C-alpha cells in the first residue's frame, strides 16, 4: 500500500519536472540514482511477487472459528492456500517461521475453544468425542505439513540448493498442547478402566464402609486432578499438573496396596481351587490393571497348572477363563 | 584394466599432439571400456561454439557439459534446449559473469583475441571453477599455431569469511609452426601441466575473482617462461648435439686446451 | 542364490565404506569447528 | 532382471563412496596442514 503510494508520488508533475530540470543541466547523477539507487523498482517487484501469498491468506476464518470442525476446515484452507507458494518467491526459512506463527495461532485458538467447553461439567463420552476431534485436527496438521514439506523439498531442489543453511526443522508451539492432551487422554483412559469396573468389583453379589471409602478416595483423586487446569501449557500449570498426577498416583497406589492385602487374604481364606476361582470371579477389574497381575502370577502356578493337570470340557474351560479374565484366549498362556 | 589404462595414457602422451583428437577417437575404438575414463584423464584441445542469443564464441568443456549439451557462460542457456538443467546458482552466477568480464579483459590484454570462458560450480563449503582460454594464431603472418589453457581452481572459503584457500591446477597445450627461408619448416608442439596452492584474504578491495585472476596470470606467465626457456632450449640443445656446425678437429683441439687448463687449475688449489 | 549372497557381501562393504566416510565427515566437521574457535579468539586478541 | 539392476546400483554406490572417502581423507590431511601452517604464521605475527 505504501510502495504504490510512493510510486504514484514519483509520477507526479512536480517530481517529474524537478527531474527534467536536473536532466537539463546535465546533473545525470541524481536522475540515474533516483531511477536505480532508490531500490523502489526492486522493492515493488518483490512485493508484487509476494502478492499471491498475502492476497488471500485465510487466517481470518481460523481466528474467527469457534468449533473444532471449523478450525479443521480453516487449517485445510490455510494449507490449500500455502500450496500457492510454488509460484510466489519467498524465503524458505521465512515461510517456515510463518508456519510456526500459524501453529502459534492454532495453539491459541484451540486453547481458547477448549477452555470454554467446561470439561468438568460434562461426561466422558463427550470428552472422547472432543479429543477425537482435537487429534483429528492434529493429524490434519501433520499430513498437510507433510504435503507442504515434500513441496518445499521440491522447491528448494530447484533454484539455490541453500548449501549454507540446511536447518529447517519446525518447532510447533501447538505440539506442546498436543502432548498435554495426549497425557490427559491416557490418564482418563486409565481412570475409566478403574471407575467402570471397580464398582462392579466392590458390588456385593445379590453395605460395608470400605467400599464407600475406596470409591470416595477415587472420586477425591479425580477432583484433585480436575482442580488443576490441565490445558495450561505454561510452566506453572505444567508443574501443578505434574503434582496433581503424582498425588493421584499416590492415592491409587495406596488403594491398590489395600486391595493387594485383600488378595493375600484370599489365599489366607481359600484352600481348594473352587474357592480361589469364586473369589477371582468376585474381582474382575483386578485382571487388567498392570499391578495386580503380579499377585495373579503368584496364584497362576497354583491354579492354571493344576487345572492343566486336571485336563490332562466347557466347565474346565470356564475354570481356565476365570483365572485369566474376560477374553482369556488373548493371553500368551491362554493361546494354548 | 588399470594396466591397460596406463598403457593407453602413455601411448597418447607419446603420440604427436596435433593429431591428439583424431588419434584419441581412433584409440577409443580399440578399448572402449576405459574410453570415458580416458577422456577424464587425457587433455584435449577445446571446441568453439556460437551463442546465438548474444552472438558470442564460448568454449565447450566437461564441467559445463550436462549430458549431450553445453551451457553458455553469457546466456546461461544450453545450446541444445534442455527442459531440465543445472544452473550454478544465483550468487555464483554473478560471480561467473564477473569472472567472465574480468577474464575477457585479461585475454584481450595478454592474447589480443582468441576466446575465453569461465564456468563455476559449487563445492563442499566453497566453490570450484574452470577458466578456459583458446587462441588460434592468425593467418596474416607465416607463423600459425594454437594456444589452449585450462585452469581449474578450487576455493575453500574459511568460516570467518575474510580468508580463503585457492588450489590452482593449470594445463597448457601449445602448438607453433613457422615456414621461413632458412629454417624451411619448424613445428613445435608441446603440453605442460603445473599446480600450486595459496591462501588469500577475501575482501571488498580483494574479492575472490581478483585472487583467482592473479593466480591464473602468475601461472600463465610461469608456464610461458618455462616453455619458452627450458622446454624449448632443451630441444635446441638436442638439435645442436645431433650435428655440429664446427668441425670435430677444432673441437678436439679446444678440448685438449681445456684439459690442460683444468689439470693446471687442479694442481694449484 | 549366489546373487543374494553377493548383495549381502556388497552391502557389508558398502555400509563399512559409508561408515568410514561418515567418520571422515565428522573429523572434517571437528576440524572446521576447532578452526572457527581458534581463529575467532586469536583474531580477537590480534 | 531387477536384481541385476540392484547389482549395478550397488556398484555405483560403492564406487561413489570410495571416491568420496578418498577425497575426504585427502581434504582432511590438507586442511590439517593448512591449519597448522597458518597457526604458526599467525602466532609469529602475534
Amino acid at each position: 500500500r505504501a510502495l504504490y503510494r510512493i510510486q504514484e508520488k514519483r509520477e507526479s508533475p512536480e517530481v517529474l519536472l524537478t527531474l527534467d530540470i536536473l536532466k537539463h543541466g546535465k546533473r545525470f547523477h541524481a536522475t540515474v540514482s533516483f531511477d536505480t539507487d532508490t531500490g523502489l523498482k526492486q522493492a515493488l517487484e518483490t512485493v508484487n511477487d509476494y502478492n499471491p501469498l498475502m492476497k488471500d491468506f485465510p487466517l481470518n476464518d481460523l481466528l474467527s472459528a469457534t468449533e473444532l470442525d471449523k478450525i479443521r476446515q480453516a487449517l485445510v484452507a490455510i494449507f490449500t492456500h500455502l500450496r500457492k507458494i510454488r509460484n510466489t518467491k519467498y524465503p524458505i526459512q521465512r515461510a517456515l517461521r510463518l508456519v510456526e506463527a500459524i501453529s502459534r495461532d492454532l495453539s491459541s485458538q484451540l486453547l481458547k475453544v477448549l477452555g470454554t467447553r467446561k470439561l468438568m461439567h460434562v461426561a466422558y463420552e463427550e470428552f472422547e468425542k472432543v479429543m477425537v476431534a482435537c487429534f483429528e485436527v492434529f493429524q490434519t496438521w501433520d499430513d498437510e505439513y507433510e504435503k507442504l514439506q515434500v513441496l518445499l523439498r521440491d522447491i528448494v531442489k530447484r533454484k539455490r540448493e541453500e548449501n549454507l543453511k540446511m536447518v529447517w526443522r519446525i518447532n510447533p508451539a501447538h505440539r506442546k498442547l498436543q502432548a498435554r492432551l495426549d497425557q490427559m487422554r491416557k490418564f482418563r483412559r486409565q481412570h475409566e478402566q478403574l471407575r467402570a469396573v471397580i464398582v462392579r468389583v466392590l458390588r456385593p453379589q445379590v453395605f460395608d464402609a470400605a467400599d464407600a471409602n475406596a470409591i470416595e478416595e477415587v472420586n477425591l483423586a479425580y477432583e484433585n486432578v480436575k482442580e488443576v487446569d490441565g490445558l495450561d501449557v505454561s510452566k506453572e500449570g505444567t508443574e501443578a499438573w505434574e503434582a496433581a498426577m503424582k498425588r493421584y498416583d499416590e492415592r491409587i497406589d495406596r488403594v491398590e496396596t489395600r486391595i493387594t492385602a485383600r488378595l493375600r487374604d484370599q489365599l489366607g481364606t481359600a484352600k481348594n481351587a473352587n474357592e480361589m476361582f469364586r473369589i477371582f470371579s468376585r474381582f474382575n477389574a483386578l485382571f487388567v490393571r498392570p499391578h495386580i497381575r503380579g499377585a495373579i502370577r503368584e496364584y497362576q502356578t497354583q491354579l492354571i497348572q493344576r487345572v492343566k493337570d486336571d485336563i490332562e470340557l466347557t466347565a474346565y474351560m470356564k475354570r481356565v477363563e476365570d483365572v485369566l479374565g474376560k477374553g482369556w484366549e488373548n493371553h500368551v498362556e491362554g493361546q494354548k | 584394466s588399470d594396466q591397460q589404462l596406463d598403457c593407453a595414457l602413455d601411448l597418447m602422451r607419446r603420440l604427436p599432439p596435433q593429431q591428439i583428437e583424431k588419434n584419441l577417437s581412433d584409440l577409443i575404438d580399440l578399448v572402449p571400456s576405459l574410453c570415458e575414463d580416458l577422456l577424464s584423464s587425457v587433455d584435449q584441445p577445446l571446441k568453439i561454439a556460437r551463442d546465438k542469443v548474444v552472438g558470442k564464441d564460448y568454449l565447450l568443456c566437461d564441467y559445463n557439459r550436462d549430458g549431450d549439451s553445453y551451457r553458455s557462460p553469457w546466456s546461461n542457456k544450453y545450446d541444445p534446449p534442455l527442459e531440465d538443467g543445472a544452473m550454478p546458482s544465483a550468487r555464483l552466477r554473478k560471480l561467473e559473469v564477473e569472472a567472465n568480464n574480468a577474464f575477457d579483459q585479461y585475454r584481450d590484454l595478454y592474447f589480443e583475441g582468441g576466446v575465453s570462458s569461465v564456468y563455476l560450480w559449487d563445492l563442499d563449503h566453497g566453490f570450484a571453477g574452470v577458466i578456459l582460454i583458446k587462441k588460434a594464431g592468425d593467418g596474416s603472418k607465416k607463423i600459425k599455431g594454437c594456444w589452449d589453457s585450462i585452469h581449474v581452481v578450487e576455493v575453500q572459503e574459511k568460516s570467518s569469511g575474510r580468508t580463503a584457500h585457492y588450489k590452482l591446477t593449470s594445463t597448457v597445450m601449445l602448438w607453433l609452426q613457422t615456414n621461413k627461408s632458412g629454417s624451411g619448416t619448424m613445428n613445435l608442439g608441446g603440453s605442460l601441466t603445473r599446480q600450486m596452492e595459496k591462501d588469500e584474504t577475501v575482501s571488498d578491495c580483494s574479492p575472490h575473482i581478483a585472487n583467482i585472476g592473479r593466480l591464473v596470470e602468475d601461472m600463465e606467465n610461469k608456464i610461458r617462461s618455462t616453455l619458452n626457456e627450458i622446454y624449448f632450449g632443451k630441444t635446441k640443445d638436442i638439435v645442436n648435439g645431433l650435428r655440429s656446425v664446427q668441425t670435430f678437429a677444432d673441437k678436439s683441439k679446444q678440448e685438449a686446451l681445456k684439459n690442460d687448463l683444468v689439470e693446471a687449475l687442479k694442481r694449484k688449489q | 542364490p549366489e546373487l543374494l549372497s553377493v548383495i549381502r557381501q556388497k552391502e557389508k562393504d558398502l555400509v563399512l565404506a559409508a561408515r568410514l566416510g561418515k567418520a571422515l565427515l565428522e573429523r572434517n566437521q571437528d576440524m572446521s569447528r576447532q578452526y572457527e574457535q581458534m581463529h575467532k579468539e586469536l583474531t580477537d586478541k590480534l | 532382471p531387477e536384481l541385476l539392476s540392484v547389482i549395478r546400483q550397488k556398484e555405483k554406490d560403492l564406487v561413489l563412496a570410495a571416491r568420496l572417502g578418498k577425497a575426504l581423507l585427502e581434504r582432511n590431511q590438507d586442511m590439517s596442514r593448512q591449519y597448522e601452517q597458518m597457526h604458526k604464521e599467525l602466532t609469529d605475527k602475534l
Binding site: 548449501n163 540446511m166 | 563449503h125 | 565427515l25 572434517n28 | 563412496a17 575426504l24
Partner: peptide, 14 residues
C-alpha cells in the same frame, strides 16, 4: 559436503 550428504542420505533411507 551437501552432495556427499545426499548420496549418504539415499543409502541411509534404503
Amino acid at each position: 559436503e551437501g552432495v556427499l550428504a545426499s548420496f549418504f542420505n539415499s543409502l541411509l533411507s534404503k
